DNA sequence: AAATTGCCGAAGACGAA
DNA sequence: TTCGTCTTCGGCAAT
């Protein structure tokens, strides 16, 4: 359904005036919070790392959701893995961060307490209001003029080599270059405070994800000229639209609550590994390329396996995170959608 | 000492052709 | 389509 998908992608185009209005409203709130945190001893070198779909140029229909990471430069860090989770770690030191130590580990909850307290106090004096202190890692979520959501995620920045659990991840050697993978792994990795049970930190590579999407092609000139337009980003947009429309259509149910845009985003990266060549993502074959993303995502649902693109042994669809009935329900609707030329693209 | 700020240009929306 | 013009974003050199 290439003709319908292009129509869907056209209605999904963000308004140029809306992003200008949205970004300015986010900028005023974000610059205010950053300026305040830089005045505290604990968050001396806090910096802005814009992540998420908007800054990956894959935002879906309106610039109403902004993912923002307040990164913190951390030196001499010792990682101890929590059980065999491969993605959750205890943070030790090999400084203003000693106030957040519980013995030898870096207490997350102590750092979120001060991070949230400073942010909640600042915006109490502001049309923005706090919320979403559940889920651990996105420390806080803001709502600007009850219109735009801003997920603020506290993060540590470690410039050391990536943890051993990422050794066989980021399999981009045949898609991007092996030099690119070497260069990307020289960039820092990020630690965000996530519950697993307490005082743990999860690995975060949203900066690598953002850099890959803005440099998606195997060819360097991909999506720079009319002869090399690909549909990678458009397939991710449609994949995000399928999940969002289904989550909205079944909002009254609880089955689709666990599935996030990161799952679709992660599954998209694996399809790019399976289809490394740009000729496998031509504009004319938008239906085939989107069906590839739909088919692979279904295999992840049916096999209960969606590897983290950077941590292979971290199953995003394991039974501990999502029950089989929720994955079976989403599998049902995706095939019904595909069998009927995706009715949710109209409602 | 270390954080700040401006500069430059690609990405992609928009209108026209 | 294709184009130009437009605005936003991100890196770092300037201190
Ligand atoms: Zn491309």
């Amino acid at each position: 359904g290439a003709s319908k998908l292009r129509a869907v992608l056209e209605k999904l185009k963000l308004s140029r005036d809306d992003i200008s209005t949205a970004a300015g409203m986010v900028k005023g709130v974000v610059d205010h919070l950053l300026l305040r945190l830089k005045c505290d001893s604990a968050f001396r070198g806090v910096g802005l790392l814009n992540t998420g779909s908007y800054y990956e140029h894959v935002k879906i229909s309106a610039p109403n959701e902004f993912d923002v990471m307040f990164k913190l430069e951390v030196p001499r860090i010792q990682l101890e893995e929590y059980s065999n989770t491969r993605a959750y770690y205890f943070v030790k030191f090999k400084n203003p961060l000693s106030q957040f130590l519980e013995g030898e580990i870096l207490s997350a909850s102590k750092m979120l307490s001060k991070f949230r307290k400073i942010i909640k106090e600042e915006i109490n004096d502001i049309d923005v209001i706090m919320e979403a202190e559940r889920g651990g890692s996105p420390a806080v979520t803001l709502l600007i003029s009850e219109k735009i959501s801003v997920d603020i995620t506290l993060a540590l920045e470690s410039k050391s080599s990536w943890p051993a659990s990422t050794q066989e991840g980021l399999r981009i050697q045949n898609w991007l270059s092996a030099k690119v993978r070497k260069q990307l792994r020289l960039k820092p990795f990020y630690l965000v405070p996530k519950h697993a049970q307490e005082e743990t930190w999860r690995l975060s590579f949203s900066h690598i994800e953002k850099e890959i999407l803005n440099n998606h092609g195997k060819s360097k000139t991909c999506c720079e000229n009319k002869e090399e337009k690909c549909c990678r980003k458009d397939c991710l947009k449609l994949m995000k639209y399928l999940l969002e429309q289904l989550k909205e259509r079944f909002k009254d149910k609880k089955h689709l609550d666990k599935f996030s845009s990161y799952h679709v985003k992660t599954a998209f990266f694996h399809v790019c590994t399976q289809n490394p060549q740009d000729s496998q993502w031509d504009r004319k074959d938008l239906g085939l390329c989107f069906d590839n993303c739909v088919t692979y995502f279904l295999q992840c649902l049916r096999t209960e396996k969606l590897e983290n693109y950077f941590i292979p042994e971290f199953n995003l669809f394991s039974s501990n995170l999502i029950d089989k009935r929720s994955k079976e329900f989403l599998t049902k609707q995706i095939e019904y959608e595909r069998n009927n030329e995706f009715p949710v693209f109209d409602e």
Side-chain angles (χ1 to χ4, degrees):
Chain A
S3 64
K4 181 179 181 179
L5 294 184
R6 283 176 226 279
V8 175
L9 292 163
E10 198 65 28
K11 86 151 68 67
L12 288 193
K13 274 196 169 193
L14 271 59
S15 180
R16 199 177 71 206
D17 299 329
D18 285 345
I19 65 177
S20 179
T21 302
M25 296 159 58
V26 176
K27 176 189 183 62
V29 180
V30 166
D31 287 346
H32 177 79
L33 295 164
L34 275 167
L35 218 63
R36 164 70 180 86
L37 284 168
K38 288 161 181 177
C39 303
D40 192 272
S41 173
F43 311 102
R44 270 201 251 160
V46 60
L48 173 57
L49 173 54
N50 288 328
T51 71
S53 52
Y54 169 84
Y55 303 98
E56 291 156 5
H57 291 99
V58 76
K59 197 58 182 60
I60 178 174
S61 46
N64 64 318
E65 305 185 14
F66 287 79
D67 291 8
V68 160
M69 174 176 298
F70 280 45
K71 71 183 193 65
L72 209 66
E73 299 181 0
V74 172
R76 314 179 185 184
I77 183 169
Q78 251 290 330
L79 285 183
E80 191 214 314
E81 186 177 349
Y82 172 81
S83 167
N84 292 305
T85 55
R86 295 295 185 270
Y88 298 86
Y89 294 84
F90 293 104
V91 170
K92 303 180 185 178
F93 292 143
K94 303 190 66 177
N95 74 137
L97 267 57
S98 61
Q99 57 166 129
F100 300 128
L101 290 174
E102 279 179 353
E104 292 192 16
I105 76 175
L106 187 63
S107 178
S109 56
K110 284 190 181 301
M111 198 168 299
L112 283 92
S113 182
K114 186 152 192 171
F115 188 74
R116 290 165 167 161
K117 185 177 184 177
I118 296 180
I119 292 186
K120 273 187 294 154
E121 287 176 348
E122 275 311 290
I123 87 114
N124 243 335
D125 313 329
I126 320 294
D127 302 299
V128 316
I129 294 186
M130 308 292 301
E131 54 223 40
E133 301 194 19
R134 323 96 238 272
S137 171
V140 297
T141 289
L142 317 187
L143 197 62
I144 309 180
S145 296
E146 50 190 353
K147 195 181 181 69
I148 295 166
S149 178
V150 175
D151 295 339
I152 300 178
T153 305
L154 173 62
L156 313 175
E157 187 182 62
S158 175
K159 301 182 184 300
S160 52
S161 59
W162 291 12
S165 58
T166 73
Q167 193 72 38
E168 308 306 320
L170 194 58
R171 318 188 79 96
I172 64 179
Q173 293 94 342
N174 308 331
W175 168 25
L176 311 179
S177 82
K179 317 182 201 61
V180 160
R181 182 180 187 275
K182 181 179 184 177
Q183 292 164 1
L184 292 181
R185 295 185 109 263
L186 297 181
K187 300 180 177 301
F189 71 97
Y190 291 93
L191 285 169
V192 292
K194 189 76 171 179
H195 283 277
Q197 179 174 249
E198 305 80 19
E199 314 307 322
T200 54
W201 303 76
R202 204 224 279 122
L203 297 176
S204 181
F205 308 91
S206 47
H207 64 306
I208 306 300
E209 305 165 3
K210 173 175 120 185
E211 203 159 337
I212 292 177
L213 282 173
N214 296 325
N215 211 339
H216 58 273
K218 161 185 280 283
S219 166
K220 295 150 179 173
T221 54
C222 190
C223 291
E224 292 191 359
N225 51 80
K226 59 176 181 178
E227 274 79 21
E228 297 196 40
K229 255 75 178 63
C230 86
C231 65
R232 284 189 179 92
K233 279 181 170 174
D234 282 341
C235 287
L236 183 50
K237 290 173 180 178
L238 290 176
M239 282 296 298
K240 298 195 60 162
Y241 195 49
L242 172 58
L243 180 57
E244 272 175 51
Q245 293 292 77
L246 289 184
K247 287 170 64 67
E248 177 65 29
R249 182 217 269 252
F250 297 110
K251 57 183 179 181
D252 294 323
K253 294 178 175 298
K254 77 206 70 174
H255 298 68
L256 309 183
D257 289 25
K258 298 290 184 178
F259 302 96
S260 81
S261 61
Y262 183 79
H263 297 143
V264 150
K265 178 187 185 184
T266 288
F268 171 80
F269 283 154
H270 294 291
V271 181
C272 289
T273 296
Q274 296 180 355
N275 300 264
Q277 298 177 357
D278 301 331
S279 55
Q280 293 161 312
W281 296 92
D282 201 285
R283 295 300 306 182
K284 183 178 181 178
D285 306 315
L286 178 61
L288 296 180
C289 299
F290 179 58
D291 195 28
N292 274 0
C293 299
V294 171
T295 299
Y296 174 83
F297 192 75
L298 285 170
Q299 301 296 336
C300 291
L301 296 169
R302 293 207 200 82
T303 60
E304 284 192 286
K305 288 181 180 59
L306 177 55
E307 299 187 351
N308 179 279
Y309 200 66
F310 310 90
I311 311 162
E313 308 176 49
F314 181 44
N315 182 12
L316 295 185
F317 285 174
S318 71
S319 303
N320 316 336
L321 304 180
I322 300 178
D323 51 320
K324 181 54 177 169
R325 288 180 290 184
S326 288
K327 281 161 290 190
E328 284 173 344
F329 180 81
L330 184 52
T331 306
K332 290 207 240 285
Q333 307 298 332
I334 292 181
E335 287 131 0
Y336 166 79
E337 233 60 54
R338 180 170 61 181
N339 291 14
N340 296 99
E341 298 180 5
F342 298 91
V344 291
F345 288 170
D346 313 322
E347 96 188 50

